A paper describes a structure:
AaegOBP1 crystallized in space group P21, with unit cell parameters a = 34.37 Å, b = 47.93 Å, c = 69.12 Å and β = 96.50°. Electron density was well defined for most of the structure, except for a few side chains, the first residue of chain A, and the nine initial residues of chain B. The final refined structure contains two monomers of AaegOBP1 with 240 residues, 410 water molecules, 3 Mg2+ ions, one Cl− ion and one putative PEG molecule. Interestingly, the C-terminus is pulled to the core of the protein to form part of the binding pocket wall, which can function as a “lid” for the release of ligands. The C-terminal “lid” is held in place by an array of hydrogen bonds, which is well-conserved between AgamOBP1 and AaegOBP1, namely: Arg5-Asp7, Arg6-Asp42, His121-Asp118, Asp118-Lys120 and Tyr10-Asp7. The carboxylate oxygens of these residues form hydrogen bonds with the hydroxyl of Tyr-54 and the δ-nitrogen of His-23 (AgamOBP1) and Arg-23 (AaegOBP1). It is likely that some of these interactions may be disrupted at low pH leading the C-terminus to move away from the binding cavity thus “opening of the lid” and loosing ligand affinity at low pH. Indeed, AaegOBP1 binds to a mosquito attractant, nonanal, with apparent high affinity at the estimated pH of the sensillar lymph, but with no affinity at the low pH postulated for the environment in the vicinity of odorant receptors due to negative charges surfaces in the neuron membrane. Differences in ligand specificities by these two proteins might be conferred by different residues in the binding cavity, which are located close to the C-terminal lids in AgamOBP1 and AaegOBP1: Leu-15 vs. Phe-15, Leu-19 vs. Met-19, and Ser-79 vs. Ala-79.
Odorant-binding proteins (OBPs; aka PBPs, pheromone-binding proteins when they are involved in the detection of pheromones) are the first relay in semiochemical reception in insects as they are the liaison between the air medium that broadcasts chemical signals and odorant receptors, which are located in olfactory structures (mainly the antennae and maxillary palps) of the insect's peripheral sensory system. We studied the structure of the major, female-enriched odorant binding protein (AaegOBP1) from Aedes aegypti, the primary vector for the viruses that cause yellow fever, mostly in tropical regions of Africa and in parts of South America, and human dengue, which infects 100 million people yearly in the tropics and subtropics. Mature AaegOBP1 is a protein with 125 amino acid residues, which shares 82% amino acid identity (91% similarity) with AgamOBP1. The overall structure of AaegOBP1 comprises of six helices (α1 to α6) connected by loops between helices and knitted together by three disulfide bridges between α1 and α3 (C26–C57), helix α3 and the top of helix α6 (C53–C104), and helix α6 and the top of helix α5 (C113–C95).
Residue numbers in the entry:
A (entry chain A): 2 to 125
B (entry chain B): 10 to 125
The structure:
Amino acid sequence: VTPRRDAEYPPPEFLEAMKPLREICIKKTGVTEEAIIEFSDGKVHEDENLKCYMNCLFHEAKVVDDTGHVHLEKLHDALPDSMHDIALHMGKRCLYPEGENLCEKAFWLHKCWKESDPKHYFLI
Amino acid sequence: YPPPEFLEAMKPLREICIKKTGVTEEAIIEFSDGKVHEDENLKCYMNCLFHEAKVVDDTGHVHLEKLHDALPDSMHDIALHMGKRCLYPEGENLCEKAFWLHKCWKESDPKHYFLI
Ligand SMILES: [Cl-]
Ligand SMILES: [Mg+2]
Ligand SMILES: [Mg+2]
Ligand SMILES: [Mg+2]
């Protein structure tokens, strides 16, 4: 299925709310705009800087536990109300990330989400 | 509700686990439909069902995706909302963590929570 992109979805308030965090995280990780857009709207691809950008966003958004790992309940609680059920179905077979570091774990989650629901998956 | 197919599938696991853990039938019904309570054998009964249902990982902790997949499809959505704030169990052993999950589910949706 093809990615949903319109005035209503992804939720504009969420996209604007993540702007400053994206700016922080692009500066820290050196990910290209092209890697982000391609991962969001195109085919899954694996780029090292993108993985740490993904991790960076979790950290800046304060959706991590006290060891720096993604806390999926905090993440759900943080998401827009309009995404409540979308996020639940997108995340339900992505509960236990695997990876040698937090960048790899963050990428595991995004890849799993994208695989699960390519229509509603997007990357800030 | 509960879905008939689940009641049927659970029966052989209940038999094994009541025998193994010594939990009382009354303890099960009390937890299922009444107030949350702690009974030691109940907690290990709960663990035993997860083990016998083969929904645990290599160290015996519940694999919540396996659990979800093992539930009747009619309970998919109910399970999802029960589970959404019950992801990271706490406890000193598998019985305490198994209880933690059941308590968390029961606290989240008492109307649809049951224990067989
Ligand atoms: Cl919710
Ligand atoms: Mg919310
Ligand atoms: Mg199911
Ligand atoms: Mg709750």
